[PDB]
Amino acid sequence: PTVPDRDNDGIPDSLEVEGYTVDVKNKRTFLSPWISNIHEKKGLTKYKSSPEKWSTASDPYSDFEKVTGRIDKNVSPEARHPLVAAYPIVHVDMENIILSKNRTISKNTSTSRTHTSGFSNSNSSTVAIDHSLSLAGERTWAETMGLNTADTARLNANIRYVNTGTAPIYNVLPTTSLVLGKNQTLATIKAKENQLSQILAPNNYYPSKNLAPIALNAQDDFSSTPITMNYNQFLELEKTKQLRLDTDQVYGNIATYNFENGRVRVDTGSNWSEVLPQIQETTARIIFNGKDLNLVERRIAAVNPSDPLETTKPDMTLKEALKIAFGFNEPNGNLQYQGKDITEFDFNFDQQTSQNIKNQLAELNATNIYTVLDKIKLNAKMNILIRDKRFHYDRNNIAVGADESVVKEAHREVINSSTEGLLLNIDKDIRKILSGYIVEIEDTEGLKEVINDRYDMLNISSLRQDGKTFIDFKKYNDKLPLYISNPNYKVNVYAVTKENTIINPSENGDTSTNGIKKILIFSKKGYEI
Amino acid sequence: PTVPDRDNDGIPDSLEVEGYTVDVKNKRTFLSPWISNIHEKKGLTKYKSSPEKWSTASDPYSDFEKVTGRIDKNVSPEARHPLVAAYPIVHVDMENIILSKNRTISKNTSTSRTHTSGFSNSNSSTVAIDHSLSLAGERTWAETMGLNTADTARLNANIRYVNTGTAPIYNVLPTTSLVLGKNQTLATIKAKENQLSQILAPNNYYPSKNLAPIALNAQDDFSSTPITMNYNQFLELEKTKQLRLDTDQVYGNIATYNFENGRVRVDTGSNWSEVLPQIQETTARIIFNGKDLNLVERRIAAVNPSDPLETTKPDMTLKEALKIAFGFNEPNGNLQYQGKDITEFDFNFDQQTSQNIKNQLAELNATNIYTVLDKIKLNAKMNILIRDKRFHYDRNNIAVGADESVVKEAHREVINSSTEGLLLNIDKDIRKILSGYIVEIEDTEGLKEVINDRYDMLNISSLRQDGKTFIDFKKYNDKLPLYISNPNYKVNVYAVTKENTIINPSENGDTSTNGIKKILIFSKKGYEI
Amino acid sequence: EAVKKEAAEKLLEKVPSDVLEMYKAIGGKIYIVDGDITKHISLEALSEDKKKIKDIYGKDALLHEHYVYAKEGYEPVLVIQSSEDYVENTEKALNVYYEIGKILSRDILSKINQPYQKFLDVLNTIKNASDSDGQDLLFTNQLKEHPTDFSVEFLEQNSNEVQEVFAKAFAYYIEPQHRDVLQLYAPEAFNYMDKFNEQEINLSLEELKDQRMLARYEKWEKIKQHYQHWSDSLSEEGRGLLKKLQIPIEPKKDDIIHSLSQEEKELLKRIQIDSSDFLSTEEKEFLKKLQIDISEKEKEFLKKLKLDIQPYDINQRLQDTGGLIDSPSINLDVRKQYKRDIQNIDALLHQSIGSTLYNKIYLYENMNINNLTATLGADLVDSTDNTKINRGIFNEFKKNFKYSISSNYMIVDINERPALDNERLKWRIQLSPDTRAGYLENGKLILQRNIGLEIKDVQIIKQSEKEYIRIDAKVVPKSKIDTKIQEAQLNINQEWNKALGLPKYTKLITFNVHNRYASNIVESAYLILNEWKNNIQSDLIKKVTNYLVDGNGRFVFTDITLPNIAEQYTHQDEIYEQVHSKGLYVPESRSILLHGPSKGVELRNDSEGFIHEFGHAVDDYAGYLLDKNQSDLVTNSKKFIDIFKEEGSNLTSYGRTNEAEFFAEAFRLMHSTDHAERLKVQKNAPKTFQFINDQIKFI
Amino acid sequence: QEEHLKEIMKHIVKIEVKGEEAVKKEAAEKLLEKVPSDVLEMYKAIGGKIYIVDGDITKHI
């Protein structure tokens, strides 16, 4: 009658080993053993867990509390499943900069969370500075700022913090250092003290998109120009136009749930820097770019044959991991994510993991992993990266290009065309790997007139408030309507993908789009327009 | 004997799920199951709550403590009901400024708490400064203050704090940053130290209307003029005449009730900054502008399908929410707010919320929400905005105008008319959407002479101490009585609504009320006057 | 299923005294079904307009909707629409209890006419309670409109309304969570249900079985086998003795006539028979029979004769003597005759009732109210309609009726039988396994003597259009009651010692009582003396009390015949000097004796009986103060004898008897509570009025 | 602290009022109680017994 539950985690042993489920009874919640036939019709998920671990994930939330909902209500749903560690991952996002000398270059920046290869448990980002020339007269970066060989420029940027993880941080915000090139550390942004009293829930901004971003330069008297930068440095920057933002994991304290009064209180004893290492040492880490081709990281608890205590965890087959971590489902028993079949994805493995999986496929006598997916055992310390198979990628695992045919197919729907511009509707994901467009007109006898014959100009495609892509050639046409020397002359439009773009003037300071690999994107005659 | 109480909150389970109420028996209070026939004559409200939550609302007050009254006596009455979260909402009100250069522009201001749109959970306000000329000769600020291109002006404002929430704050006072334009942060208001020893009960000012408002500039030696302001900045201000006040949610400690001896002591463990996140992720938010056209926000506990624990809360239909949150009642079984039927109000939904309600409206086969109102299910996180259907609104959801026809009825009651002015009695609410009046004279043959023919000369309407509006003609006249060239000449009075007002001289500095959209408001001949 | 059946199982488990047992007895059945719309062959026979039902709150009405319903007649069966949420859903459970309580009151209790009056007064107390909350809770508007208080006719005329109010209360009490609610708004009602559902309900069940003759026979049969060995071992002397006990033994005239044989018989021949107050009516018939065959010193010879013509009635001596068998109140030979038979009978009841074969058994006995108190018995029955009882006199009777003791041999029945006209009491006696008793073949039982009984309740019940008094009882050791009497003795004596000024420890109001109406007698002392004190001049009491205390005399209140107490017999010394009446005064012992049980053929109440005896003692002291050496009364002084010759006949004929009693009648009258009476004696005996004031002057 | 309140509470708050004159009778009886009962029997046997007056002891018959 006692009911033995050694781990002291509320759920009894047999329940944990065999399978249980939470089910709301009219207004009272009770825990029940899985009955195959009567629970299935209501769409309840079959849980499993460890009878010997107070928190199977090893994160600060018990097996019981998570599934019952007795937990900080901010943890994202996807982490409600008993086998996914919920923990924070903070990186910094820089939106725009301004420059001067210890005539102000104010450019908007774009950042992407990065990942490179032997990849380690440390967050880093990579900013890319806009190259298009916002001002006509701002030829030559060296001159627009009266920069001298023995001068120094001051940098003043705007940044915000982004949480793409699964758990909240409370007081602290991590210190993080900017670095140019391979090893030239320009500055480390101080960790302001007792000022980040607000909360960073997953998928939220700090400060939120509705507030002024934190000025990077203090604007106070702490240092006149904390971010000094020698001449050679500025040159290096012009040649690379790319920075790195490395951050450590010194987050704050943890909020735990108290049974006596149901209060979620911030405990001053527990600190994330003690929990994170265990999790990072007992889970397989999977990176997925399905949602928006951005690096989303999830962690699953896997078995390690070598450890007695660890054999207690439920054997976890890959397919289910994918099912519970991201939203994959089986309408007809075929794995798919919002239409896209599983076969459209790549599998990349670290050398260790490679060896292990080669073994697993050897004891099964199979060659196509896509079939035997549900018979593959996951072990501890595997690292898996699943990226869409259709796109080309660079060294920093950022989406950088793609095969032309997909690109062309993405345009076969011309919603409108006039002498004032095009109003297209392209799938929101593609227009982030296209740097810009070169528009040109072709005489009936094979001539070629490129309107924006300047590399910077390319950026001519804006987006209307109704999600319709709109190309405004007017800005670089000197506010002159597009002229056509022949109602029979075809108008050709080409698109340039990121991978094939140029970021600085060429050898002979070429401004023409000649040596650029160009893809044909449009061709309507003059009468058709 | 067991009388099971899982949530451990004093009220037993069965009572909590179906409905209970406390009723005073001669001098002793006890808990009883709702009896339909014996309580209704006594006028008690039927409560419901969650048997598995120490505080169904999730705010720092237990289900049991709150309804019985063993609780801090400052929580506003309407928030005593268990399904209305009680928490603070602080914004800042600035009463008047004065200007000079590091010939003093001293103007009185009026502020309104703002909210704009994808609208997020962060308090901010917006002041609008009157443009009217207090002094005749004070044309052009640039000259009234000897401001030069290379000069600097000093800013000195007066502010007071208003608590429009539902719970008291004790120790701390919020940080708040001043911002002109889109992103030019002029100042962050210091957190005065060991000075907010007073209390902010709901609907109160700190300090009270009887005391000097807190001078913004320290008047001490901290910074001579922290709020410097370059020339170009002053220009931005001149075109927009508007400011923004961004404030965060870093409140103080919490006042809790101790059952053993009834002492309410401020516990140093609980801090509002750990609780707000809970509220913000588990309630549906209802914003209402009914009372005085000021935005009052309330939060209601709604169910969230995805979470077992959350499914326990009593189902909450919209109809009761308005009843229990604001004071709506059923004189004749028809929902109305102080006479005004529900049909005179708009329903606006966030894109998320919109989608959800469309589903709910389909399985009921209805098109007019006003019918199935009591059949609309609330899910967690909808944000709902109920505004008076009769008035026009601007981008920041502030009351800004109305249909002209409505304006006229508000004037059909001429209590008296003479050659010295009108003493009207207008509904206090309309006379906050009228910027000023145009006075004009009409020759017996149809000519038109407008007395106050300057953009900044409209503030001619005062209010008498008995709430009777009194219009003074002699103000912007020559301190002379009213002349009439013909007892047959018609006397017209014009009103100018906010939306149609000008805030700066035009291109060619026009000051005439020519290009102002005017609605006809009055026309009496000389005999009537 | 398993849980649903278990769910129902738990519901029925809360029912208090397993009301299923009477329910099955009336042929009721319990069915767990689904879809009561779609109901069952057992039901569906009444699909009519009556399909509209009102829940506890009175709102809904739909045969399909509501889950609980009962057949409502002719061995009704109830359908509950079985489900699984009944355990936790109170609002769903209340209706289950509400209808189950409704069939009990409408079909069960109605079959035996209870509730009757006992519930009615609760009702009256509800519409007349200070706060108007409670009424609203237990009855609809139809009842609310009643302008006056609820009488028995109203309950019998509607009966639908009462069943409704009753059922609701039953329901609220069984549901654990609402019990507290009940106590707050209807305290008395809670009290009623509280005592109802936990002791009388078991008592109530048996009477239901008591109507089926077969059941009665089974109980009777079950008693037979237990007594087979004892019965088989009965001797002739026991049965012969037992035979005598059942039937009263009549004296034979021929034996007595042959027993006198002297001149007294001739003397008796010519005597004015119809002129003796001492003789009673029944004794005159005996004398009249003898007279056919055959105010001076001849009435003294009649006193002896009275002590010899009484019938041989064993049971009767026993109450008269209170268990003191050695009383020298009768001839020694007769005394020897009685003592042997009872002691022999005492040995006969050697078999104890105690067994493992049976639990709580209740027995009944019909008894005449005039046997306990002819004073109450004289006005107990409604003057106009003998089938109803006047509540006003009833209220006095129940007041202090709390426990009783039986010193004689109880003759009890086994099954209730119709009573004779003069039997209005219906006793329900519980027994203890330790009580010694004898069994009778004629369907009666003989209990051992010296049994103690505590009264648990006093109520009016209805049966076959005639009114009765229902009295329950539990047998207990007499000693437990005896302890109450001494502690009661001390409470009363200590109080009056302070009020009078006497030494703390005097034994003055000592009373020894062993009869059926004991408890009221004791409490009635706390009232006779209060009226006694407030009405007499303070200095007279102290002075007179001093006289009594100066000797060992004590007041003695009893429930046995005066000639048998202790003091009376010893000093008189003559056997024939015995006297019995409502009161008596012994000058020699200076004691006042008050026999409660009898009723003064003249006196209006008990206090007057006391005052009369009080007169006799006081009259003695006045004469004592005149001269100490001589023992004499106030009369025999030439200044009073004459006064009796003139005014002696201007008042009641009873006082005209002689001088001694004459003083006593006037004494109460001059101090009567009705000033008119005082005025009356003034204008009827003016001389005495100044005379009496002269003896009391001596102070 | 919560412990101590109870003991003081019982001593001071007399729940019901015996009455104006009952206390007098109750006081004397308790007093004579402490003397061994056997003494009282000896007193009665030798005759007179103690009676409690209420007024000025100086004036009694």
Side-chain angles (χ1 to χ4, degrees), chain C residues 40 42-55:
Chain C
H40 198 261
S42 67
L43 214 63
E44 204 75 24
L46 73 171
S47 314
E48 276 98 16
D49 180 78
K50 50 176 148 300
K51 54 202 177 263
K52 278 76 70 178
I53 75 180
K54 290 301 179 175
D55 64 78

Side-chain angles (χ1 to χ4, degrees), chain A residues 85 315 419 519:
Chain A
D315 184 357
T419 181
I519 302 299

